[PDB]
Nucleic acid binder design. Structure first.
Ligand SMILES: [Ca+2]
Ligand SMILES: [Ca+2]
Lengths: 7, 280, 280, 7
DNA sequence: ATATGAAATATTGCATAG
DNA sequence: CTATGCAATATTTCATAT
């Protein structure tokens, strides 16, 4: 789940 | 309001026109004079005319209507936005904190600073997910109007992201769905739509709903290609590769998605994201 | 007028507000009434508040101010634009022609129609380059104001393209330079900026000015990446490959640009453009 | 010069 | 909840002045 | 070229009415 959430 | 006035005078001089020239077919030259001196707000007809002749988006005259330093604030906002995109949260934290301590009154801009500061604080682990959410909800409870009609939705998206990455999948997923619904109603902001679908897709995936995740991913990829946006397209291909793997597609289709992601990460110089691509 | 009025009333009802609710902290409920009945034009303060509470871009209220069918017109413009992007000039020629023959009065939309009709007529070889240029110049000579602040520049870009591809490189190049100069003065339209630099790069290349061509390409590619646009980026990479070849760079640098172009042509499904990629 | 100008 | 007369405010055009 | 008094138009509020 390496990619971050996009704020 | 004398700020509107001198913005009109500034741009008229910059265009080499005199009051008489500007007033043509629109109004009397003396009304232009009174508009530039701040003695009068112009009606829609007259403003529309002045904006057209001066080649200025009409929202500009509304922006400068009440609060000061609007050009600088807009570049500031675009800077923060770029940095957020790049995940440079330390810098955002420092940059926005400096601006915040000027204590200037401008509710919408202050709300933008606070939103960004809290997210930055949370990502940096200076504050816990629960406190971040409560502070964000308080910005919403401001019921702030503003020029940027999407700002509350942006805050809701942050709230939904934080629920989602702290185990509250159901709450996050339900908040994403509410945002997409509120978007149906508002004028098109299709980049934001793509971003919400992406975060939503991540949350669905964490909840093991692989098929629905891929649905949102493919929908967002379609929207991205139609509007020619690259902002999240790399991440989307990566996510689609993730979904394809769980759904047991053929190895070639899986490899395709990851290659497309690696392409975008390269050319967009997304160095961080490149790690996730190990062993695929 | 009646149009603004019923438009505010429609959107208010859609939001389930009453005149009193809408009016809170903005104005008296009776002024909302008189605004919706079209008895009065509202002042900037009141319009601004009303647009904020209703979450509508304020330009929307100006767009509906004078001419009818504004939503349909905007979808029409968007369709024409997408088709132009796809080089579907036959369809543009037909679609625009049907719309033109309604002879409705709306100067700015009229102009957009004629502009696109002539370009399509020109590309389909129904009319010669010189007649097209003259007709486009006549649209410019309208000195038309309008909502879309960039339309005159769009027409200028068309004229410059036509000079360029009919042997008039010097006149084309010089008009491209004027356009880029006019843009720095206007608010940001960075996608347009990318397109102009691309057309310019093509003209420069046809004039054998390979280094200046590459300069414009790389500048356009940098803007493209910064704003996250894919609109012109495949073409730009192709063109970068073209210049790299003429300037005798290493084969691997050259092949890189061409592979990158092939990538965007694939995923954006630009089938036409794929032809040009034979033997490289 | 196979690519078109962009109108 | 909305709408309208009448009064109070606010704008714009026309004449004119620096 | 711009600015201002003053008259002419326009808008907004407050008090009511349907
Ligand atoms: Ca005033
Ligand atoms: Ca009126």
């Amino acid at each position: 789940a390496d990619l971050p959430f996009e704020f | 309001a004398e700020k509107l006035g001198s913005e009109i005078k500034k741009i008229r001089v910059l265009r080499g026109l005199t009051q008489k020239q500007l007033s043509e077919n629109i109004c009397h030259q003396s009304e232009v004079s009174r508009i530039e001196s701040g003695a009068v707000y112009p009606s829609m007809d007259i403003l529309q005319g002045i904006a057209a002749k001066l080649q200025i988006p009409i929202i500009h005259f509304y922006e400068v209507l009440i609060y000061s330093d609007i050009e600088r604030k807009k570049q500031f906002k675009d800077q923060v936005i770029m940095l957020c995109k790049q995940k440079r949260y330390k810098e955002i934290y420092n940059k926005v904190w400096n601006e915040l301590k000027k204590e200037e009154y401008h509710p919408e801009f202050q709300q933008f600073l606070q939103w960004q500061y809290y997210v930055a604080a949370y990502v940096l682990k200076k504050v816990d997910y629960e406190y971040c959410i409560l502070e964000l909800k308080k910005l919403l409870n401001q019921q702030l109007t503003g020029i940027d009609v999407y700002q509350n939705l942006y805050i809701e998206n942050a709230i939904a992201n934080i629920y989602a990455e702290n185990g509250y999948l159901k709450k996050g997923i339900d908040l994403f769905e509410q945002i997409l619904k509120q978007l149906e109603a508002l004028h098109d902001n299709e980049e934001f739509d793509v971003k919400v679908r992406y975060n939503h897709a991540k949350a669905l995936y964490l909840d093991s709903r692989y098929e629905e995740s891929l649905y949102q991913v493919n929908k967002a990829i379609e929207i991205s290609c139609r509007i020619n946006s690259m902002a999240l397209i790399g991440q989307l291909y990566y996510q689609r590769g993730e979904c394809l793997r769980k759904l047991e597609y053929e190895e070639a289709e899986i490899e395709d998605a990851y290659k497309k992601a690696s392409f975008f990460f390269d050319i967009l110089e997304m160095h961080a994201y490149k790690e996730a691509l190990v062993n695929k």
